[PDB]
């Protein structure tokens, strides 16, 4: 009865996309041309959240693919579970953004905003009555930061009353992909503040640290990282499409954890995550699980979980398993390590249990934090800003394009704000 | 769906694009007939029955080179509209070539450009290639640019320079030249690699380790590098770029837009038997000094922006340490304002290898491309011979006899000052 | 069903119908026997047995041009008495055409048209082809006008003539020729295209790459317009037109009646291996003005009607969008007072080509006949050459001694300074 509908634009945000797709079409039990071959009765009642019925039992996903050049829409199509979308949901452009925020949201974007935004209202008026919206991108680019703020504000404007949650990959601490790239997350990051309900926090750098100590792949590519922010996102949305005994959907994750309104970002998990060779050595219970949850090594996001405090704290388990040993366990690792949780929060952990696991595991959990050390991340964003805006280093390609320097010192006069309101809580 | 249109000045031009169709019609399965037993869109048009013409124009003010393409085994190839020539040479006189026998010529190559662009739908920029030293390369590549970002306007235009080298050169007027299109061309261009002859000349006789090489090895290992720079739209990878972006990346500040390039690994036939080829070890191969393709010393000044374009077989992880362990060295310093200086790009297609040829097969490849400070001591030095034969007007008249006058000289030496006053200004 | 009768009078006549004739006789595959190994009705008459009269009177003075198509490969064609020949010729003499010579072979060349125009139904209009420098292709021609419209009433008649060059001509006496027809036939012709002898060399210079062409290729491109104005009555199409539509949809004002013609593709066998001829392509080379077959510029006058005529594999959608994308073009302006400004025709089957000559199998082709502004030019140049041999009095004693006193001199150019001042009004 709550559907969501699914925005993917960029580049980085088109492969988490298809990977998502891949991965929610074989937890739902359907083939690559969209024919359903499930054995259970349970992946059919509440397939609405994310398909639609079209003409003899196929099933459409509830997805709209958008980019500026069509390089990479060509790519998903010709690939494998390419032929699920809908043709006219392939909305894309000729010119290309150039890794420029300008371009991305000034130049190209408002001639294809209008026909984005036809198709996310049709597929509005077709669905019941929607939970909301999700996006994926990057903060480092031109069509991913740029568009993606276009998009959402545009959407806040005409639907102000649902939940819009954002999948975003964030710029890393040593080693970068893109000369401008500060510039587009400090732009990026002051419309975020304002216009969005919660925005998960994800690095390239911390995937390629549990690729490298914990899963001790040699050759990892882009489609295990791809991979583990798709078992994120179907883990945090698993509770609408099963029946469990303890159930949360979004908006009961939107109360719950953001207590004053600007501070939703957070940093995800996923357990277990195994070797091949260590698999047969250990068991599957709750402390394992729990104990490999709250640990440094494991965050997706580059900022020791130990150099602040935590506000609040998700845990959605999946799988058959007993609510004493949960709740027992979270009050045992609330008490062990005090001095890292608000002390004027008390019990600060959300518990929630599925009952469907993913497709070949016995149980599994996500994690969700909400911590101040955060702040970390971005004031490493600021002062990088701030040295090349005292020179108007790489400035005019941006400002031949419609904008102004007053609005990049609003925006690093907001990101310090946001700073600040970080810093007053600690 | 989205294109490039390359245009060839001057002999140097001519040749290195005979080298760079030669390699592009090799890679794709194309026959010199122009018919092949859809990526290649971007850069051939396909005409009526199985036959692929490509998206070339070649212009010269003397006959004797087109011809030889005209007459030789690529007869069949191009559009025998496309193949524009003269009469008489420009004599390496700039003024021949901007002014006086250079502008019979330029209404029929911007009619062939516009009767080529109307048939894209996704252009995106110009590939023009010229050398510096000569008369109708550096007098009508000026003037074609000053048509083009008049008529076309916020499209991309790079260019491919022939830098010349400190001792060894050819003609006497060289300095003039050099001096008089590098004011012209500042103010049209977007980006403009440097390549040398003698930095060539000493990567072909300590690496491959061939003694004598004539020209057609430089336009091989050029070609090269332009197939590694668009590669990233004739393929698909798995990081890529186009090409607008390198503009976004590596030009600063308006007037500083000239990089220098690198290509590895190049290697022999026997060398490449005794060595495994990391991703680690070609990344801090291309940072050496030894491998620049210009005659400069990088040691000499610090680096404002870098762009690596890998093919082949490579995963991100060894790239991101490898330029993590670039930046933990002393001796490879960037500048302050700058604390995010790297661009990356990996594609999936390896290099193809021609035969007859002395590159070796391998599967991994890196394109190198640097914006630095060092190149002002190379600015300074040509300004230096331009200030001798200035104290003497020593070869004026053939210029002055042309339509060009004293005060152009005085101008364009202002020019060259105030951009060294700015390198300095920006380094230090 | 609807049939038209082709009448050529003059040497200019007889050499472009001896072209048209093989051109017509290619097409519907008929031998030069007449016999045939049903839509030729529309110009052939069935004697018999499968033996084809066309539908043709050759008129002439001069009997050395008839008695070598009397002797050439159409001996058996053309029935005896059709060819009507004289005994002395014209001499280049208007006055010879009209007054004296002519006027004993003109009843005789009615009564062939009044027995040809028995054997008919439904009688559409006729075709002159005719020059204006010449003797008897103008008094001849200017005489059977005028009895044309005297007898035959509202019934179409077209006209083909030949415009004199500027820098190339042949006779001496020639604008004296050209003022007093163009005064004389401009109140009985209804329609009436040019063509230039000066820009067909410089097309079959330029686009088919012919050095030296001889008059054959010359009749060769005018018979393949004549054969695309009336290959909508010929055959089937999706969109046809025929002779009574074009002086309803060209000629606004009853003394405007010269439009002039274009025909495309016309390239080579070697240059249409290497292009795809869609129909934009072609629809923008007819509006080229390199490519007119009257030499003036239309870039210095205002469109008044523009006519296509289409044949082969074209679609209607994209025609219409080829005239859509040239109506936005500003290079091309069309006047204020009409702004429906095209009329467009249709046609399935294809040009075919007649063997040993110089034009090359393609699908589709255009015939563009465009009325414009820019040829009141050309009757300025004409104007002005008659001033000057009439400031003093020369070889005015030939035309006076046969038969026209000196006035009519005054009125045919007070009439052609009333076209300019028409042109002039309409146009500005
Ligand atoms: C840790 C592990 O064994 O996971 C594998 C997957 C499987 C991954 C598989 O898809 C592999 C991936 C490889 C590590 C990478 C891979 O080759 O590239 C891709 O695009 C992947 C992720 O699809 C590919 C093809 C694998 C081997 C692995 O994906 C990873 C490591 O991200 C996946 O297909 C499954 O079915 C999983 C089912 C059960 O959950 C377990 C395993 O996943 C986890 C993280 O627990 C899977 C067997
Ligand atoms: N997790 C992934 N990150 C990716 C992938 N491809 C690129 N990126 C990240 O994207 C960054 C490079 O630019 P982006 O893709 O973010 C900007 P984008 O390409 O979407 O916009 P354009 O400039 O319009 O191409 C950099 O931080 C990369 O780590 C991918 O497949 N997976
Ligand atoms: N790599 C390479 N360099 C060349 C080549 N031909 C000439 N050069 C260099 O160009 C400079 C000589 O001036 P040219 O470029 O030949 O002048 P041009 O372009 O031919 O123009 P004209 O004066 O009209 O003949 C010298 O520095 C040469 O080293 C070539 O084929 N390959
Ligand atoms: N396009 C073309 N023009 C021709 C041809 N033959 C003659 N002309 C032109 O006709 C003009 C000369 O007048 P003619 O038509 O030949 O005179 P005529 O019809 O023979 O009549 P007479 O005066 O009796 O000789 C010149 O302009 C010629 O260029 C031809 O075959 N093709
Ligand atoms: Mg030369
Ligand atoms: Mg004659």
């Known amino acids: 009865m709550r559907e969501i509908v699914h925005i993917q634009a960029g580049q980085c945000g088109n492969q988490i996309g298809a990977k998502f797709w891949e991965v929610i079409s074989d937890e739902h039990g359907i083939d690559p041309t969209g024919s359903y071959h499930g054995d259970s009765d349970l992946q059919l009642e509440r397939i609405n959240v994310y398909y639609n019925e079209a003409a003899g039992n196929k099933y459409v996903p509830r997805a709209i693919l958008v980019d500026l050049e069509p390089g990479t829409m060509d790519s998903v199509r010709s690939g494998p579970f390419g032929q699920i979308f809908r043709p006219d949901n392939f909305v894309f452009g000729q010119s290309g953004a150039g890794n420029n925020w300008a371009k991305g949201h000034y130049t190209e974007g408002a001639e294809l905003v209008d026909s984005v935004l036809d198709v996310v209202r049709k597929e509005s008026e077709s669905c019941d009555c929607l939970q909301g919206f999700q996006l994926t991108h990057s903060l480092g680019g031109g069509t991913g930061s740029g568009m993606g703020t276009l998009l959402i504000s545009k959407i806040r404007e005409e639907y102000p009353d649902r939940i819009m949650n954002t999948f975003s990959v964030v710029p890393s601490p040593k080693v970068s992909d893109t000369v401008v790239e500060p510039y587009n997350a400090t732009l990026s990051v002051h419309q975020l503040v304002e216009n969005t309900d919660e925005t998960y926090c994800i690095d390239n750098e911390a995937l390629y640290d549990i690729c490298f100590r914990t899963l001790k792949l040699t050759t990892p590519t882009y489609g295990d990282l791809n991979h583990l922010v798709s078992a994120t996102m179907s883990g945090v949305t698993t509770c609408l499409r099963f029946p469990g005994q303890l159930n949360a959907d979004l908006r009961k994750l939107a109360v719950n954890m ?63 398993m007993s609510m004493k040993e949960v709740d027992e366990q979270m009050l045992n690792v609330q008490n062990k390590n005090s001095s890292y949780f608000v002390e004027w929060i008390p019990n600060n952990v959300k518990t929630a249990v599925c009952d469907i696991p993913p497709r070949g595991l016995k149980m599994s959990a996500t994690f969700i934090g909400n911590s101040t050390a955060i702040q970390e991340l971005f004031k490493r964003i600021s002062e990088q800003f701030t040295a090349m805006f005292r020179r108007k280093a790489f400035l005019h390609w941006y400002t031949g394009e419609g904008m102004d320097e007053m609005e990049f010192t609003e925006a690093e006069s907001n990101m310090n704000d946001l700073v600040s309101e970080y810093q007053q809580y600690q | 769906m989205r294109e490039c249109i390359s245009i060839h000045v001057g002999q140097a031009g001519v040749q290195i694009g005979n080298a760079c169709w030669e390699l592009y019609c090799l890679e794709h399965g194309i026959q010199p007939d122009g018919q092949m037993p859809d990526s290649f869109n971007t850069f051939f048009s396909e005409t009526g029955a199985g036959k692929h013409v490509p998206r070339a124009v070649f212009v010269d003010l003397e006959p004797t080179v087109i011809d030889e393409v005209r007459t030789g085994t690529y007869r069949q190839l191009f559009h025998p509209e496309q193949l524009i020539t003269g009469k008489e040479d420009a004599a390496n006189n700039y003024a021949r070539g901007h002014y006086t026998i250079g502008k019979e010529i330029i209404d029929l190559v911007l009619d062939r450009i516009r009767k080529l662009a109307d048939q894209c739908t996704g252009l995106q920029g110009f590939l023009v290639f010229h050398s510096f030293g000569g008369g109708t390369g550096s007098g009508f590549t000026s003037l074609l640019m000053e048509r083009l970002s008049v008529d076309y306007g916020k499209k991309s235009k790079l260019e491919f320079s022939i830098y010349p080298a400190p001792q060894v050169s050819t003609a006497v007027v060289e300095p003039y030249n050099s001096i008089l299109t590098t004011h012209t061309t500042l103010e049209h261009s977007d980006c403009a690699f440097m390549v040398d002859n003698e930095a060539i000349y000493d990567i072909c006789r300590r690496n491959l380790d061939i003694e004598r090489p004539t020209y057609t090895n430089l336009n091989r290992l050029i070609s090269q590098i332009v197939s590694s720079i668009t590669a990233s739209l004739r393929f698909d990878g798995a990081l890529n770029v186009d090409l607008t972006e390198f503009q976004t990346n590596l030009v600063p500040y308006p007037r500083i837009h000239f990089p220098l390039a690198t290509y590895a690994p190049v290697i022999s036939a026997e060398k490449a038997y005794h060595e495994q080829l990391s991703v680690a070890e070609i990344t801090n191969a291309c940072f050496e000094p030894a491998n620049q393709m210009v005659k400069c010393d990088p040691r000499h000044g610090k680096y404002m922006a870098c762009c690596l374009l890998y093919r082949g077989d490579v995963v991100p992880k060894d790239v991101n340490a490898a330029i993590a362990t670039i930046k933990t060295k002393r001796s490879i310093q960037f500048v302050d304002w700058c604390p995010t200086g790297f661009k990356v790009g990996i594609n999936y297609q390896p290099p193809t290898v021609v035969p007859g040829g002395d590159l070796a097969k391998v599967q991994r490849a890196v394109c190198m491309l640097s914006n630095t400070t060092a190149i002002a001591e190379a600015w300074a030095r040509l300004d230096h011979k331009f200030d001798l034969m200035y104290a003497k007007r020593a070869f004026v008249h053939w210029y002055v006899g042309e339509g060009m006058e004293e005060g152009e000289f005085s101008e364009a030496r202002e020019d060259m000052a105030a951009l060294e006053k700015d390198y300095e200004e920006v380094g230090v």
Not at chain 1, 264 to 271: E, I, K, L
Not at chain 1, 272 to 287: F, K, N
Not at chain 1, 306 to 312: D, I, P, V
């Open chain 1, 258 to 320: 953001v207590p004053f309104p600007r501070l939703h970002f957070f940093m995800p998990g996923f357990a277990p995550l195994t070797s091949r060779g260590s698999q047969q050595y250990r068991a599957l219970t709750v402390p394992e699980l729990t104990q490999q949850m709250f640990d440094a090594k494991n965050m997706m996001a580059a900022c020791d979980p130990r150099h602040g405090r935590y506000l609040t704290v998700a845990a959605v388990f999946r799988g058959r």
